[PDB]
């Protein structure tokens, strides 16, 4: 019960402050809500109909999302380009000297 | 129309009430808690347990979505909203049964989930 506006011990956070993101944390049998500064790793923020919520980051070989079609940080050993990750770095530009960015 | 509820790990015995919105029958499965906002828009064979606070969907449609997500039966802990019972009397013909509970029975059920020791649950009519 941290970051909520209305709260229950069984359900955790019910409603969030406008500034925080709603997120259902699972724990085997338990499921309780949380309001967070940002969405947890592997999730990106979504200003939903009633709630700011967290959607799962589903991009090809990406590990961290800003948005649905844009990647922050790729699967280690992949090269990022315009929010997309590649093993075979494309013909647009070559990888930079050390850092993995085409 | 009342119902019996029993719980054991891999013990507890409670009572409750079926809802006229759904179809009354027995059922068995694992015990999985669900947040009210979860049922909006896990492996199957489980009896869901949802504690309702004092809206995304109607309770019937929340029970509908619970079954459609692969739930053997819907347990509504209505301790914090007794009016929920009145608004589940209208018949909708839901498949999986919708049982209601509250009080120290509901308190007991939720502590088993709180303990985080995996357990199985069954319902008889």
Residue numbers in the entry:
A (entry chain B): 40 to 141
B (entry chain A): 35 to 44, 56 to 86, 93 to 105, 112 to 182
From the paper:
Rspo (R-spondin, also roof plate-specific spondin) proteins are evolutionarily conserved from fish to humans and have well-documented roles in a broad range of developmental and physiological processes resulting from enhancement of canonical and non-canonical Wnt signalling. ZNRF3/RNF43 specifically targets these Wnt receptors for ubiquitination and turnover, hence reducing Wnt signalling responses. Direct extracellular interaction with Rspo proteins inhibits ZNRF3/RNF43 activity. Here we report a molecular level analysis of the ZNRF3/RNF43 ectodomain structure and its interactions with Rspo proteins.
The crystal structures of the ZNRF3ecto–Rspo2Fu1–Fu2 and RNF43ecto–Rspo2Fu1–Fu2 complexes revealed a 1:1 interaction between Fu1 of the Rspo2Fu1–Fu2 and a single ZNRF3ecto or RNF43ecto chain. The interaction interface between Rspo2Fu1–Fu2 and its two receptors RNF43 and ZNRF3 is essentially the same. It involves an interface area of 990±105 Å2. In contrast, our single structure of RNF43 in complex with Rspo2Fu1–Fu2 displays no dimeric architecture. No dimer is observed in solution for RNF43ecto, even after binding to mRspo2Fu1–Fu2, and we also see only a minor propensity for spontaneous cysteine crosslinking of the P77C (corresponding to S90C of mZNRF3ecto) variant of hRNF43ecto. We note that the residues involved in the dimerization interface of ZNRF3, albeit conserved within the ZNRF3 family, are not conserved between ZNRF3 and RNF43. Furthermore, two glycosylation sites exist in RNF43 and map to the acidic region of the β3–β4 loop and the β1–β2 clamp. These sites are not resolved in the RNF43 complex but might sterically hamper dimerization. However, neither our biophysical measurements nor our structural data for an RNF43 ectodomain in complex with Rspo2 provide any evidence of a similar dimerization mode for RNF43; a finding that argues against ectodomain dimerization having a central role in ligase activity.
